[PDB]
Amino acid sequence: DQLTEEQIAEFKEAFSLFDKDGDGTITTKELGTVMRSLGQNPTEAELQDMINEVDADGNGTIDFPEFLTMMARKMKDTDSEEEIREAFRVFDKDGNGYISAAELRHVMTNLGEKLTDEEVDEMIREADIDGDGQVNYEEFVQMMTA
């Protein structure tokens, strides 16, 4: 059923974490910046490859539809769990199976987001189905699905 207004806002939030200058386009420099913030080390040719896979208009940057297309391909076939587990590990830095409030704050700080203790606690609450104050792997998965 129908793409929803809230779904769109979620995608727009993700786009804004890349598009830090809010000019409406994601460059290879912006892609690289976010990826390195998340502990990755892509090469220039790898960033170009990412953009070329979805650069429908050939202008060398990513616009909103092209960004959605990137996402749709990523989210398509995740049953191996390889990709989801890689993303979870970004957050679960100590590898203990639970994303703590401190761990979430680390990632949000790396992404350039200023948040209060109360804001981050509310984020945990959103994902924290079992109420234990931390986000496990299944809870993380459910945040993408849900």
């Binding site: 809230e6 806002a9 979620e10 995608f11 727009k12 939030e13 993700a14 804004s16 974490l17 890349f18 976010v34 990826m35 998340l38 990755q40 990137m70 996402m71 990523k74 989210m75 990709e83 989801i84 890689e86 993303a87 970004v90 957050f91 979430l104 990632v107 949000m108 992404l111 987001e113 948040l115 804001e119 509310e122 984020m123 609450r125 959103e126 994902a127 993380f140 945040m143 993408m144």
Partner: peptide, 20 residues
């Protein structure tokens, strides 16, 4: 008002794209 669900979903989606 700050929407924690949107914020966390946006960050998760970003991290998924930033993966191999």
């Amino acid at each position: 008002s700050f929407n924690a669900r949107r914020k966390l979903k946006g960050a998760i989606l970003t991290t998924m794209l930033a993966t191999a």
